[PDB]
Design a protein around this ligand. Structure first.
Ligand code: HEM
Ligand code: HEM
Ligand code: HEM
Ligand code: HEM
Ligand code: HEM
Ligand code: HEM
Ligand code: HEM
Ligand code: HEM
Ligand code: HEM
Ligand code: HEM
Lengths: 145, 140, 142, 146, 140, 145, 146, 142, 140, 145
């Protein structure tokens, strides 16, 4: 139920839709910063906490953004296979456990930011399934945080 | 090394193989499969990620992060400042593990033995040039 | 000998073997063309149902009839009492004919042979078939 | 009255189900039920089977006789597509009943309605017409010259 | 009740539906689905086996034991002494749970609303006669 | 690996093969007692422990045998779906935990008895896959016993 | 540890390629390489094959022994789908090694990693896991009771 | 005799013939059912691997083993030295059994017969097969 | 260089691509297509064989002799004395034409950019090792 | 007519048949020498004219044999496409024109040798089509010789 085979399939579809054969491999950054900006707004978190403390034009923060969108992509594209997704998420979990300043309440903020931006870019976005799944991913990463 | 044009071929061909591919988990696992078959001395170098069983959720999780990283880099090949930073991040994530130059050189052989099979066209050089660009970045 | 488990395997395989409609003829001839080969001197016992022209209506009926009886026995293998009675009748139906002792052994070899070709030698249990095919003949020939 | 092609196929189906080539336990249930009525509607008939423990349906001697009949019918039902052969069989089966002092043509009508009563209770969606059309085709051959 | 002949129809038809069926887990789950839809008062009567979610491994496990039991009985319909014993065993496995006569009567409606759909032929009576034979055995 | 999708498929096949459209629904008993006899022999366990203490012709023991073959069938036919199989097995586990006289070492004995008899009846029996799976089933039932 | 169905199929494929049923020249290259390491990682082991011109790998006497092994493994690898039979074979192969003073269980582990090193060099896209899973299944049977 | 070109044709056909997996059994039985027919007195030599129940695991292993050896020879036909050594071992593995002289000739006829049915008699070179099959037996029987 | 085992992989993979391939004329032409695209300086190096038009019977004739030669060599990889001789023959057939080491190095890139695409599996190294073995033989 | 689409197809088939997925890439030599021996016999030509003057075990002559079988294979596999076959043959022609000792009457001898050996090895050999085509190939090579 909670983010089932179909939900995931659509998510992975619409996600690979925002990153189709024309967009992906060009501006994951434009999408990425958009994510963060939306993140900072909701989470309230201090941008002065990531590489280069935000600054959309900071070589470090960019690389940082890239690595975030990537992680998200790795997890999303694996929602169909539960077993391995849990692993992927736990790994992420561990990485954040080791970062003083990551609250479970925020992980979901960042997770909801992805969904929201996806919808902005992809109007078709099944905002119901996305949250259903991004909820799952937000649980694995911020598990216990 | 990986010039403006050699970056094109590669980016498109990676999309054509890794992108078009069925389930990355297989493509990803397949990659490390080679790395081991062309340099067994490394198979144990991943004693952490449950290499004992490559079909494990544990191990597959790892292969994905790599084909994933390998992906988050190729798309950044045009962004010098950005990819340099990312590469720095990665290169340092490999600091702990004792990696020689034969490992990376093996990795490239692994990556370039997998990719071509999934394409109709594949530029030998252009790829090596860029794998280099990446390999270096992730070590020195 | 013909253990319960054999009867199981024998009942099953024979089911598969025992075709449907005229497919039984397929099996039928199979066992006959064999019997009349290794033992040509046996075709004479069927001069009435025309053992000479195996493909004729006379013998085809006959052939089919035989498979009929042989199907009762198999189907009855679990219930010894009824089987006895079944074998008794059969026995009295061969009591007249001057059937050679070495006839039944041959027939059994041809049958067990036919079924095998029919169900495929997918690890055909010759011991189960023979152990049971023999339990049958015993009541008929004797 | 003509047991057509669509009839035999249809009957062979009815008889395909409600039948087990593996175990005789069912063949007997069917037979017994057939005999049940047969006698029930012709006490006198039961006498013809004194040669079998008819008095005790539930007896080996008898259930054995059931198998023979149930088998004989099944053997004929399967020839239903190969007429030439069937004839030989019915001819055969016939002579066997002639060799039985008593059993006369009529009797096959009681036996006819006997099956006609039991079948619908053993095979699903049984098609009476086709069975009645072909059961005759067969019975007529056995009761012929009888 | 379930006589020698009515046992035939049923046994063959159960094989034809339950046997031929695709995945029993669905067929099994489908069965209880009805039982609830024709008598909601019972859905909670399975508060133990995780009825809250019928697609659960927990609940499906239960449905199987039943369609499984339902199966281990139909095949024993000819064995009076045997099935009587088994039925006794079952009837007593239902002692604890407060079951009225409407539940069993509902069960039969459930079983007989599922089965026919999977067949080309299905004898109404013959079935009821036997479900009765079983139902009684499992209660009194 | 240990009893994988394919193994199970073959097992479930060959099992439904021993119980095809001709045998099943007639003599699960003949097969069942055969199982037990083979069980008693190997396990050494006392037949005087089950309903009617063996006695192949005991109405109680028969019903008992039936219920055993059934359980086995329920579990086997569910090897393809892990999640629900575990449940089915745990239930069995519980049932045996509540029976003073069931040793894990014996559960496997009974489990190996099934395989063996299957092979006797079905010569084709993939005795490698069967043990691979019957091992799994034997673990769930005798878990902790 | 269980050599599954998908494993044997996968191994039979690996071994399907890198193999020639027409010429033994390749079977030998494979074998020799296997032995190469085997001894290279257990000089003492080489002694067990004094019965063969091991001292001279490139010798008929020896290459002949290679064929036997390479063949024996191929004969077992093909039974991998028919367990019952395989057992008989491994059982056989087993007794043959018992009949050899020396060779003990351990030795099959060196032989194990020996192949594990050569295969990836003969068959393309070789799947180590499946080979390790099944090579055991076989080796265990031969080294059993040894 | 067994000219190089024959060895070629023999290697090729045998490849096609020598099935895969259990298909070899197909061929296997083919040569056995024959041998044990024309020469029933030969089934006794296999009382150990159960020559009586050809379909059993014992004999099936055995059967398969035989095809194994026979495949080495064929595969080795080009290299005489290794072939000799291969035949030597085989020879010492039959040195014990009381195998009748007229056994190998029969076997060869059954094999050459099997392969033919298997690869289809598409102009089957009996001379090449015999010329070569004989070169083999020579080292084993003698 | 091209050892006993690396010869195996290659021989089988060449058969799998060149062998299985549809019409060699295309496969052959495709090969030289790359050689030119990865080293245009060579396209004119075949001014004799009518390179002006690669679809010509004239040019295709040439590509075949090469993929043909390339083939008559791989099968001889195990025959040291034989292939050495053949290679000598070839190397000397290239004496006249002014060929540098970048040409051969380019040829290998051409051959190894074509082959992998036609396979499911392709060993990077093993191939290079052998192309080397051949390349050297055909020059020095 | 003279070696038409079909003839060629069969030739190319049967040739790729003598060199199937088991034989080719192993003993083109065994076949090759066989060719020559049969050549020398018919043509009468002096083996002491090729690299290593025959001597089946001469490294040079072998390489030589290989190169001959190869040429033959290149031409055969191109019989379907006339245009390019003519080219291939002309090239061969030129190569032999430059070799004092090659008579058209002999070229066909060598060509007929191939067919004959093919038939020996491949009994199925459509000896009618083979000669029909090997005639064509023998004309292109020994053209004007
Ligand atoms: C939706 C959930 C999230 C995703 C997809 C995600 C994923 C990632 C990934 C893939 C990395 C790079 C791994 C590495 O360091 O090697 C990372 C690092 C990091 N993340 Fe997250 N993250 C999430 C939420 C958050 C939140 C809510 C915070 C806290 C405000 C946060 C802060 C950081 C920081 C500070 C780093 C380390 C930067 C560095 O490399 O120095 N993350 N995250
Ligand atoms: C240029 C290609 C490579 C890329 C893009 C890459 C990618 C990665 C990534 C993304 C991770 C996971 C880091 C994390 O998120 O915590 C990782 C870990 C690792 N990599 Fe690499 N890598 C490369 C080269 C290599 C090579 C050549 C080797 C050795 C054969 C190697 C050895 C390792 C090991 C041992 C780990 C640690 C995993 C563990 O055992 O916990 N990598 N790599
Ligand atoms: C166990 C195997 C056998 C079975 C099931 C069997 C059964 C039968 C059956 C069903 C009949 C017809 C009875 C009737 O309606 O009067 C019959 C007749 C006959 N059987 Fe057998 N039989 C078997 C083996 C043999 C053997 C071993 C021989 C001799 C080679 C043989 C020779 C005959 C002959 C001569 C007849 C009479 C032909 C006629 O109808 O005129 N039977 N058998
Ligand atoms: C059309 C349906 C029938 C068929 C196919 C059939 C079948 C058979 C068969 C196969 C036998 C055993 C042959 C033997 O060993 O002699 C038999 C015996 C016999 N049948 Fe029929 N029969 C049919 C109808 C009838 C009817 C209508 C009667 C009379 C009421 C009858 C009277 C008998 C008697 C008296 C025996 C001998 C009992 C004994 O001594 O065992 N049959 N029948
Ligand atoms: C005649 C049809 C029925 C059959 C064959 C059947 C079968 C079964 C079986 C095999 C079990 C599991 C026992 C075990 O292995 O521990 C079970 C349990 C149970 N049954 Fe039935 N049953 C039937 C009728 C009913 C009816 C009519 C109801 C009520 C609507 C009912 C209520 C229950 C409940 C509540 C349990 C206990 C499961 C739990 O909550 O733990 N059953 N039944
Ligand atoms: C392969 C594993 C086994 C299977 C398939 C199995 C399954 C079952 C099942 C389905 C039942 C009926 C459930 C019920 O009582 O309501 C049962 C009961 C029972 N089992 Fe097992 N069992 C296994 C092994 C064993 C072993 C090894 C023993 C001990 C020697 C054993 C002894 C019993 C006893 C005594 C009962 C209770 C009989 C009764 O109803 O009074 N079981 N088992
Ligand atoms: C699992 C892999 C192996 C297989 C399938 C295999 C295969 C064979 C075969 C088929 C033979 C010839 C049978 C005969 O004529 O006696 C043989 C002989 C032999 N094997 Fe193994 N073997 C294996 C592993 C080993 C190991 C691990 C050792 C010890 C290091 C060993 C020691 C020997 C010896 C000493 C001989 C006899 C040498 C001679 O006198 O010719 N084998 N083996
Ligand atoms: C050229 C054809 C033949 C080949 C390739 C061949 C090869 C073999 C092979 C591979 C073995 C197993 C050796 C071992 O592992 O110990 C064997 C055993 C045997 N062979 Fe042959 N054989 C041939 C012909 C014959 C003939 C002509 C006979 C006699 C009719 C025969 C009778 C036997 C016997 C009796 C055994 C021993 C059975 C046992 O394992 O107990 N073989 N043969
Ligand atoms: C290692 C791979 C190579 C092989 C197997 C090969 C094969 C051949 C063959 C068989 C011929 C035709 C000779 C004849 O039959 O007369 C040829 C000619 C020729 N090759 Fe190569 N070659 C290779 C490398 C190269 C390279 C690297 C180049 C330059 C890019 C080159 C340049 C030429 C030229 C220019 C000719 C003469 C054709 C003409 O213009 O008339 N070859 N080669
Ligand atoms: C069926 C027609 C023939 C074929 C397939 C053929 C093809 C070839 C080929 C492909 C070569 C190697 C090209 C090279 O030298 O670079 C060659 C060379 C040669 N051929 Fe032919 N040939 C044929 C007939 C003949 C005949 C009849 C003779 C004369 C008796 C002959 C004698 C030679 C000689 C002496 C060489 C040069 C050997 C060397 O490399 O020094 N050929 N031929």
């Amino acid at each position: 139920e909670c983010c089932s085979r179909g939900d995931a399939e659509v998510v992975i579809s619409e996600w690979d839709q925002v990153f189709n054969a024309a967009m992906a491999g060009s501006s994951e950054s434009a999408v990425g910063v958009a994510i963060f900006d939306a993140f900072f707004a909701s989470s309230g978190v201090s941008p002065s906490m990531f590489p280069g403390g935000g600054d959309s034009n900071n070589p470090e923060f960019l690389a940082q953004v890239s690595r975030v969108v990537s992680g998200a992509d790795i997890a999303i594209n694996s929602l169909t296979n539960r077993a391995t997704c849990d692993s992927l998420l736990s790994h992420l979990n561990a990485q954040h456990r080791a970062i003083s300043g990551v609250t479970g309440a925020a992980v979901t903020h960042l997770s909801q930011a992805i969904s929201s931006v996806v919808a902005q870019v992809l109007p078709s976005a099944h905002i119901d399934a996305w949250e259903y799944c991004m909820a799952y991913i937000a649980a694995g990463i911020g598990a216990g945080l | 090394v990986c010039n403006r044009l050699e970056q094109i071929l590669v980016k498109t061909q990676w999309a054509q193989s890794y992108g078009e591919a069925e389930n990355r988990a297989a493509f990803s696992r397949d990659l490390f499969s080679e790395l081991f078959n062309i340099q067994g001395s490394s198979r144990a170098l991943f004693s952490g990620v449950g290499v004992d069983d490559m079909n494990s959720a544990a191990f597959t999780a790892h292969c994905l992060r790599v084909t994933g990283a390998l992906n988050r880099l190729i798309s950044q090949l045009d962004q010098q400042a950005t990819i340099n930073a990312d590469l720095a991040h990665l290169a340092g994530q490999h600091a702990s593990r004792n990696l020689d130059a034969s490992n990376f050189a093996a990795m490239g052989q692994a990556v370039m033995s997998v990719v071509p099979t999934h394409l109709d066209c594949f530029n030998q050089h252009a790829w090596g040039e860029c794998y280099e660009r990446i390999a270096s970045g992730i070590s020195g | 000998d013909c253990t319960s488990l054999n009867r199981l395997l024998v009942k099953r395989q024979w089911a598969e073997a025992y075709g449907e409609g005229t497919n039984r003829e397929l099996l039928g001839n199979r066992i006959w063309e064999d019997l009349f080969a290794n033992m040509p001197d046996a075709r004479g016992l069927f001069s009435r149902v025309n053992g000479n022209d195996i493909d004729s209506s006379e013998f085809q009926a006959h052939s089919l009839r035989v498979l009929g009886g042989l199907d009762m026995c198999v189907a009855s293998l679990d219930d010894v009492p009824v089987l006895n009675a079944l074998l008794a009748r059969l026995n009295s139906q061969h009591d007249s004919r001057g059937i050679p002792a070495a006839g039944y052994p041959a027939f059994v070899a041809s049958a067990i042979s036919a079924v095998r070709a029919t169900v495929g030698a997918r690890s055909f249990d010759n011991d189960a078939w023979n152990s049971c095919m023999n339990q049958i003949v015993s009541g008929i020939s004797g | 009255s003509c047991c057509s092609s669509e009839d035999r196929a249809n009957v062979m189906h009815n008889w395909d189900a409600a039948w087990s080539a593996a175990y005789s336990d069912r063949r007997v249930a069917l037979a017994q039920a057939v005999f049940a009525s047969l006698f029930s509607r012709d006490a006198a008939a039961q006498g013809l089977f004194s040669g079998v423990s008819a008095d005790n349906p539930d007896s080996a001697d008898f259930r054995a006789h059931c198998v023979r009949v149930v088998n004989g019918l099944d053997v004929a039902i399967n020839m239903l597509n190969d007429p030439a052969v069937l004839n030989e069989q019915l001819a055969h089966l016939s002579a066997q009943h002639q060799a039985r002092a008593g059993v006369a043509a009529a009797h096959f009508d009681v036996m006819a309605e006997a099956f006609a009563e039991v079948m619908p209770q053993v095979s699903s969606c049984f098609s009476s017409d086709s069975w009645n059309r072909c059961f005759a085709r067969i019975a007529n051959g056995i009761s012929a010259g009888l």
